């Protein structure tokens, strides 16, 4: 019974920091990279689309350009880790990691962003 | 390039009526029912989970119990049609049909529900 799991369903991160959001999927010893599809989104925004052992940045939402990456090292360990660099207040929301690997499933992850006045003020007027 | 498509991304339905929400996926001549995964949800509520040629009502959200069904006749024609009977105001929302069939994709469908005063009054006072 194919299941994606999340060690943490909540992340509290500081504006300006890097975060790694993780989800696990069952890998039995050896990864079948051909069959693997990893897809990250927040609300409805495409972050990552890993298919046929390669990311597809053509479909990636502009706000996550050059600052969103899948950690391919961890994929062998059944960990689809999404790193977001330079976290903004816009990154606060519900993420979804959708994985297909024989079966298919997804999990939700809530991200809260703490920001000082200055950063908040700018986001407020936007 | 595996793609789910929706003829209509918006449905306006009357309280008390039945609705059929549709998604298409490419079927090349013959359906491989073993590989097919169809999954319907509305705002994170599980409606349908079709896998290994069979629905799984164990994970189905209670509000869609006995009144939500996948049209299996149309699956061979690459049409994952979700029928909801006796539409309520609670059914208004964003639906997602997630399909895995070799590749994987999903589409969003917005449903609006028109209801008379009486039905609205009852929904208003949850
Ligand atoms: C068979 O069960 C499912 C199946 C699919 C499911 C079905 C079909 C396709 C895809 C999928 C795969 C990759 C993609 C993609 C879509 O579109 C493009 C990007 O790459 C998924 Cl994912 C989805 C869900 C479930 C069931 N889960 C288990 C409980 C519940 C859950 O975990 N909720 C979240 C809790 O935080 C729903
Ligand atoms: Cl996590
Ligand atoms: Cl439709």
Author numbering:
A (entry chain B), B (entry chain A): 17 to 142
From the publication, what sentences describe this entry?
PD-1 binds to two natural ligands, PD-L1 and PD-L2, both of which are transmembrane proteins belonging to the immunoglobulin superfamily. In a healthy system, PD-1 engagement by its natural ligands inhibits a T-cell response, resulting in reduced effector functions, leading to cancer cell protection but also chronic infections and decreased autoimmunity. In cancer cells, overexpression of PD-L1 leads to the progression of T cells into an exhausted state and decreased tumor cell apoptosis. Here we present a systematic overview of the principles behind successful anti-PD-L1 small-molecule inhibitor design on the example of the m-terphenyl scaffold, with a particular focus on the neglected influence of the solubilizer tag on the overall affinity toward PD-L1.
Diffraction-quality crystals of the PD-L1/2f complex were obtained by using a sitting-drop setup. The final resolution of the obtained cocrystal structure was 2.1 Å (crystallographic parameters are shown in Table S2). The asymmetric unit contains one molecule of inhibitor 2f and two molecules of PD-L1, which form a homodimer. This type of dimerization upon the interaction with the inhibitor has been previously observed for biphenyl-based scaffold inhibitors of PD-L1.32 The terphenyl moiety of 2f provides a strong stabilizing π interaction with ATyr56 as well as numerous hydrophobic interactions with, both PD-L1 subunits’ amino acids, including ATyr56, AMet115, BMet115, AAla121, BAla121, and BTyr123. A strong salt bridge between the BAsp122 carboxylic group and the protonated amine of the 2f molecule is also observed. Additionally, a hydrogen bond between BArg125 and the terminal hydroxyl group of 2f is observed. However, it should be noted that the electron density of this terminal part of the inhibitor is poor, suggesting a high flexibility of the 2f solubilizer tag. Therefore, the presented spatial orientation of the solubilizer tag was based on possible protein–ligand interactions. The molecular conformation of the main aromatic m-terphenyl core is well conserved for the small-molecule and protein–ligand crystal structures. Therefore, we postulate that a correct preorientation of the core m-terphenyl scaffold in our inhibitors is primarily responsible for its strength in dissociating the PD-1/PD-L1 complex, as it avoids a thermodynamic penalty because no “torsion adjustments” are required for the inhibitor.
